[PDB]
Scaffold this active site. Structure first.
Site, mmCIF file in Angstrom:
data_model
loop_
_atom_site.group_PDB
_atom_site.id
_atom_site.type_symbol
_atom_site.label_atom_id
_atom_site.label_comp_id
_atom_site.label_asym_id
_atom_site.label_seq_id
_atom_site.Cartn_x
_atom_site.Cartn_y
_atom_site.Cartn_z
ATOM 1 C CB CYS B 108 -0.890 0.074 1.096
ATOM 2 S SG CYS B 108 -1.951 1.625 0.929
ATOM 3 N NE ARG B 111 2.171 0.423 3.677
ATOM 4 C CZ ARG B 111 3.272 -0.293 3.767
ATOM 5 N NH1 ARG B 111 3.524 -1.072 4.951
ATOM 6 N NH2 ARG B 111 4.210 -0.017 2.889
ATOM 7 C CD1 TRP B 280 -6.854 9.727 -2.133
ATOM 8 C CD2 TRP B 280 -7.864 9.762 -0.223
ATOM 9 N NE1 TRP B 280 -6.027 10.215 -1.105
ATOM 10 C CE2 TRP B 280 -6.592 10.295 0.110
ATOM 11 C CE3 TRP B 280 -8.751 9.882 0.809
ATOM 12 C CZ2 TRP B 280 -6.003 10.776 1.254
ATOM 13 C CZ3 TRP B 280 -8.267 10.477 2.090
ATOM 14 C CH2 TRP B 280 -7.210 10.753 2.352
ATOM 15 C CD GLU B 285 -5.230 3.017 -6.851
ATOM 16 O OE1 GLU B 285 -6.023 1.883 -6.569
ATOM 17 O OE2 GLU B 285 -5.364 4.063 -6.242
HETATM 18 C C1 HEM Z 1 -6.272 6.864 1.692
HETATM 19 C C2 HEM Z 1 -5.810 6.498 0.411
HETATM 20 C C3 HEM Z 1 -5.303 5.250 -0.257
HETATM 21 C C4 HEM Z 1 -4.393 5.143 -1.340
HETATM 22 C C5 HEM Z 1 -3.809 6.232 -2.479
HETATM 23 C C6 HEM Z 1 -4.005 3.845 -1.334
HETATM 24 C C7 HEM Z 1 -3.100 3.337 -2.539
HETATM 25 C C8 HEM Z 1 -3.119 2.167 -2.866
HETATM 26 C C9 HEM Z 1 -2.492 1.506 -4.111
HETATM 27 C C10 HEM Z 1 -2.413 2.292 -5.508
HETATM 28 C C11 HEM Z 1 -2.653 0.274 -4.037
HETATM 29 C C12 HEM Z 1 -2.458 -1.004 -5.173
HETATM 30 C C13 HEM Z 1 -3.587 -1.119 -5.992
HETATM 31 C C14 HEM Z 1 -3.324 -2.212 -7.166
HETATM 32 O O1 HEM Z 1 -2.305 -1.760 -7.618
HETATM 33 O O2 HEM Z 1 -4.321 -2.745 -7.397
HETATM 34 C C15 HEM Z 1 -2.977 -0.036 -2.819
HETATM 35 C C16 HEM Z 1 -3.269 -1.471 -2.040
HETATM 36 C C17 HEM Z 1 -3.616 -1.736 -1.120
HETATM 37 N N1 HEM Z 1 -4.075 -0.891 -0.028
HETATM 38 FE FE1 HEM Z 1 -4.084 0.938 -0.209
HETATM 39 N N2 HEM Z 1 -4.653 3.348 -0.556
HETATM 40 C C18 HEM Z 1 -5.129 4.057 0.240
HETATM 41 C C19 HEM Z 1 -6.064 3.571 1.371
HETATM 42 C C20 HEM Z 1 -6.037 2.375 1.901
HETATM 43 C C21 HEM Z 1 -7.048 1.804 3.037
HETATM 44 C C22 HEM Z 1 -7.772 2.778 3.811
HETATM 45 C C23 HEM Z 1 -6.669 0.609 3.288
HETATM 46 C C24 HEM Z 1 -7.214 -0.337 4.331
HETATM 47 C C25 HEM Z 1 -7.518 0.195 5.426
HETATM 48 C C26 HEM Z 1 -5.714 0.203 2.290
HETATM 49 C C27 HEM Z 1 -5.070 -0.822 2.247
HETATM 50 C C28 HEM Z 1 -4.316 -1.679 1.040
HETATM 51 C C29 HEM Z 1 -4.175 -3.155 0.993
HETATM 52 C C30 HEM Z 1 -4.331 -4.129 2.060
HETATM 53 C C31 HEM Z 1 -3.453 -3.085 -0.446
HETATM 54 C C32 HEM Z 1 -3.033 -4.433 -1.021
HETATM 55 C C33 HEM Z 1 -4.260 -4.897 -1.838
HETATM 56 C C34 HEM Z 1 -3.961 -6.183 -2.450
HETATM 57 O O3 HEM Z 1 -3.080 -6.840 -2.367
HETATM 58 O O4 HEM Z 1 -4.691 -6.699 -3.566
HETATM 59 N N3 HEM Z 1 -5.271 1.316 1.476
HETATM 60 N N4 HEM Z 1 -3.076 0.783 -2.138
HETATM 61 C C1 LIG Z 2 -8.504 1.518 -0.446
HETATM 62 C C2 LIG Z 2 -7.867 1.510 -1.682
HETATM 63 C C3 LIG Z 2 -7.589 2.465 -2.132
HETATM 64 C C4 LIG Z 2 -6.951 2.966 -3.368
HETATM 65 N N1 LIG Z 2 -6.304 4.076 -3.802
HETATM 66 N N2 LIG Z 2 -6.633 1.641 -4.130
HETATM 67 C C5 LIG Z 2 -7.093 0.454 -3.775
HETATM 68 C C6 LIG Z 2 -6.884 -0.705 -4.687
HETATM 69 C C7 LIG Z 2 -7.892 -0.872 -5.412
HETATM 70 C C8 LIG Z 2 -8.345 0.193 -6.565
HETATM 71 N N3 LIG Z 2 -7.728 -0.209 -7.864
HETATM 72 C C9 LIG Z 2 -7.335 -1.740 -7.933
HETATM 73 C C10 LIG Z 2 -7.999 -2.189 -6.509
HETATM 74 O O1 LIG Z 2 -6.966 -3.167 -6.065
HETATM 75 C C11 LIG Z 2 -7.562 -4.345 -6.072
HETATM 76 C C12 LIG Z 2 -6.473 -5.455 -5.202
HETATM 77 C C13 LIG Z 2 -6.557 -6.848 -5.912
HETATM 78 C C14 LIG Z 2 -5.689 -6.743 -6.988
HETATM 79 C C15 LIG Z 2 -5.844 -7.150 -8.108
HETATM 80 C C16 LIG Z 2 -5.935 -8.659 -8.679
HETATM 81 C C17 LIG Z 2 -5.262 -9.515 -7.649
HETATM 82 C C18 LIG Z 2 -5.199 -10.922 -7.924
HETATM 83 C C19 LIG Z 2 -5.774 -11.206 -9.365
HETATM 84 C C20 LIG Z 2 -6.360 -10.444 -10.234
HETATM 85 F F1 LIG Z 2 -6.922 -10.492 -11.506
HETATM 86 C C21 LIG Z 2 -6.494 -8.923 -9.922
HETATM 87 C C22 LIG Z 2 -7.625 0.487 -2.449
#
Ligand code: HEM
Ligand SMILES: Cc1cc(N)nc(C[C@H]2CNC[C@H]2OCCC/C=C/c2cccc(F)c2)c1
Ligand code: HEM
Ligand SMILES: Cc1cc(N)nc(C[C@H]2CNC[C@H]2OCCC/C=C/c2cccc(F)c2)c1
Ligand SMILES: C[C@H](O)[C@H](O)[C@H]1CNc2nc(N)[nH]c(=O)c2N1
Ligand SMILES: C[C@H](O)[C@H](O)[C@H]1CNc2nc(N)[nH]c(=O)c2N1
Ligand SMILES: [Zn+2]
Lengths: 407, 411
Positions: B108, B111, B280, B285
């Protein structure tokens, strides 16, 4: 124990068995991944020798033959006697090609089997090393039609008689610290540009001064040589649409030639082994030109494009980056110097992955290095799972010689 | 022991000691690095040590380690485990736990924000209609008419694994995809299979390019049920470009609220299998991944076509050029409509500052470089040059298999 890698764009799954022939350690544990760290006796030698010759004789379909067993004993004899051994020409060629084939960080390995190996094991002096190196540069440059090559100097003995090219690459531009406080030319090379001057080189003190070679034979003090300029192919950088681009006064060299690594074959160490291929565009246009601590030209280019530089979210850095990289490719192409774009190179590497899985049981790959430094996710390697592990023969890092040299 | 990470752009060297508190496995060994692999009923036996580690951490964070209140709570949890097999978190522990799962999420980039997280406690929920109501409220609170606030909603924990609460949607808000007989896809190709589940469950599909999917909600191990989020609760942004007036005519829009709903939250050995959270967007993304993957909306050709780029050779960089224009459009549109978004430059700069503060105050910050570096313009963001250590702390968010794979249908 058999590991699968999936491509998330194509759903193609490959099965990796080659990793079980893995020997050296990655840096990672079960508790910590170290995947993004840049750098994580007679008794030892025969196992190492045996492992290599075993794969050598397997490759020429002669595993377990009289000739196989014969050579295994000859080498065993020679080690028991001399504390080292010599590679047959054939073994050298195969080992060099394989070190490249095993370079997990190299996107260009589809080419691994077309490598011209220049055997310089008969070399004794820096002047000798200079002659060998000019010949490599000329061969490899081929007037712009670049050809991959490596030149291999004599192997380590007691480690007090190392052959070393002190340059990091055969051809690089000088860097000078200015009173002013900024930096003229390439800031990566400030230290080295000083060591050359601290040794007599006469610095033109320009933005793009080709560094002299600094060559170490047999562990002696190293010596300076200018590479003949007619042997250094260079490309003036212009844009196919922006007439003003040329006035930036940018150029780059055609030949990428890494000269500070250590080649290990069958336990033997070749501390001077400069090798060269051809550039992927981004190496120059993204890294050399746009890194903060490199030429760092983004601001100047952005200005000339009249972009809104007041806020990061106009994406002015990103716009300028693309144009600079378009310029690099256009230029090299126009002057007929070999270059590959990151689209065509990463596509090539995917094809190479499928070949190595189909033919060898796998392909060690370092995703952090393989994915280009721009537009990662629109290149196919972004979506490709890779498994990183270390196989021999290999290229390895080694400490810069100035830290080590006994003067 | 102590580990060093170097930033190769700034020469800044950081020391990690927090990795010594790491328990779970990475997937890597001394012989193989699995750093780019995408996915690498409990007994009383294992539960009390996991409870104990968690409560030692909670109690140190509030400066009451070894307190009477700490010891009484250990004893109380201990007894509850031997008598009931499990235990309930106090409100304060739940809040703390959900914040730390976010703090510990090494993939993430966002954070820096970890401590401002609205926690909604939905552990009194019993039915799918109850879940729908909880989720609507989350979506309205988080949306806040464009001024996005991070939030998480937490449904009852797993008991025997036969009674799970699940959100079947991968995110609360996403668009349908429809495979056509001719092999083309309408709408988002990532969501085809799920759209089909919805259709067969009774959803009447409008069958356009941007149909917001219904929620499919499972309470207490029961068959899941369909619900439509009130459209007035789904903030959306039409995508236009500041210089290119033909951009609007591509007919693109996106939703403002990114809300992951398919992960599992582990706190002190307890497993919350439904815990939708939202923040947000980072513009990439949407602009890079959502619109420009070949397996997603895939609009690069259409865009470059309108831009009149030389499209005959990849070496014109037509793809790279179009990609940047789409990403400009995304950020422009969100900003113009007053919906919170961050660009990848500003988000990666904030992350390096967060990460360094984390090393100074906590002794480390686990980070997964493969995920943190943005999917365009990687090396011009400061994260590219940042060495990172990846390891697993709890509390944490984890993947879990899609529930249509495991659910026993009742009828
Ligand atoms: C506040 C604005 C936030 C931004 C800009 C942000 C940004 C991101 C981005 C760009 C990703 C990767 C998404 C992707 O490539 O698919 C991500 C992944 C993740 N974020 Fe955030 N995040 C935010 C808030 C949060 C919140 C509130 C949580 C939970 C409390 C969170 C937990 C996670 C987790 C667990 C992942 C990994 C997801 C996965 O492995 O599929 N994030 N974050
Ligand atoms: C809380 C939060 C904030 C933020 N800015 N982005 C996110 C992640 C969101 C917004 N855009 C893609 C989405 O992440 C999905 C995470 C799972 C990853 C995709 C994925 C994993 C395994 C197989 C597959 F096909 C796709 C979460
Ligand atoms: C034929 C065209 C070639 C291409 C397009 C190419 C491509 C690349 C690229 C883009 C890198 C990343 C370098 C960086 O980002 O700093 C790299 C690294 C590397 N390549 Fe190649 N390569 C080529 C030929 C060769 C040859 C001939 C060899 C050796 C015989 C080689 C061995 C290596 C090694 C050992 C590394 C990593 C060095 C390190 O760890 O710093 N490559 N390659
Ligand atoms: C044979 C070949 C072909 C090609 N296209 N590129 C290369 C790589 C060349 C050309 N661009 C950077 C250079 O790579 C050398 C490794 C650079 C990594 C930085 C680095 C490594 C160790 C210590 C350190 F401080 C920095 C080699
Ligand atoms: C910290 C990180 O490992 C470092 O910046 C790497 C990232 N990926 C790279 N990739 C390539 N191809 N070349 C590099 O020099 C680097 N630098
Ligand atoms: C195979 C590879 O790990 C996979 O494509 C990863 C790479 N990095 C990523 N980074 C982010 N932020 N999101 C992703 O989906 C991915 N995908
Ligand atoms: Zn690893």
């Amino acid at each position: 124990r058999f590991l699968k890698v999936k491509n998330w764009e194509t759903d193609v799954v490959l099965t990796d068995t080659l990793h079980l022939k893995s020997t050296l350690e990655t840096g990672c544990t079960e508790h910590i991944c170290m995947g993004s760290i840049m750098l994580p006796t007679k008794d030892q030698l025969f196992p190492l020798a045996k492992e290599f010759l075993d794969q050598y004789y397997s490759s020429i379909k002669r595993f377990g033959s009289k000739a196989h067993m014969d050579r295994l004993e000859e080498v065993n004899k020679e080690i028991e006697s001399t504390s080292t051994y010599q590679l047959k020409d054939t073994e050298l060629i195969y080992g060099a090609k394989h070190a490249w084939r095993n370079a997990s960080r190299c996107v260009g390995r589809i080419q691994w089997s077309k490598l011209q190996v220049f055997d310089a094991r008969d070399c004794t002096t820096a002047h000798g090393m200079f002659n060998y190196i000019c010949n490599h540069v000329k061969y490899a440059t081929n007037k712009g039609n670049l050809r991959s090559a490596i030149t291999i100097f004599p192997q380590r003995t007691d480690g007090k008689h190392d052959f070393r090219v002190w340059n990091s690459q055969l051809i690089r531009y000088a860097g000078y610290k200015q009173p002013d406080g900024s930096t003229l030319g390439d800031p990566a090379n400030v230290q080295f540009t000083e060591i050359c001057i601290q040794q007599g080189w006469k610095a033109p003190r320009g933005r793009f001064d080709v560094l002299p070679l600094l060559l170490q034979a047999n562990g002696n003090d190293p010596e300076l040589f200018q590479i003949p300029p007619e042997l250094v192919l260079e490309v003036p950088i212009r844009h196919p649409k922006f007439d003003w681009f040329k006035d930036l006064g940018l150029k780059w060299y055609g030949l990428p030639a890494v000269s500070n690594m250590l080649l290990e074959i069958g336990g033997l160490e070749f501390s001077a082994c400069p090798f060269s291929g051809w550039y992927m565009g981004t190496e120059i246009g993204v890294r050399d030109y746009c890194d903060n601590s490199r030429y760092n030209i983004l601001e100047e280019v952005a200005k000339k494009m009249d972009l809104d530089m007041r806020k990061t979210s106009s994406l002015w850095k990103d716009q300028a980056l693309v144009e600079i990289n378009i310029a690099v490719l256009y230029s090299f192409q126009s002057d007929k110097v070999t270059i590959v774009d990151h689209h065509s190179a990463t596509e090539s590497f995917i094809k190479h992955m499928e070949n190595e899985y189909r033919c060898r049981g796998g392909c060690p790959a370092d995703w952090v290095w393989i994915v280009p430094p721009m537009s990662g996710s629109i290149t196919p390697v972004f979506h490709q799972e890779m498994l990183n592990y270390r196989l021999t023969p290999s290229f390895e890092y080694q400490p810069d010689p100035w830290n080590t040299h006994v003067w």
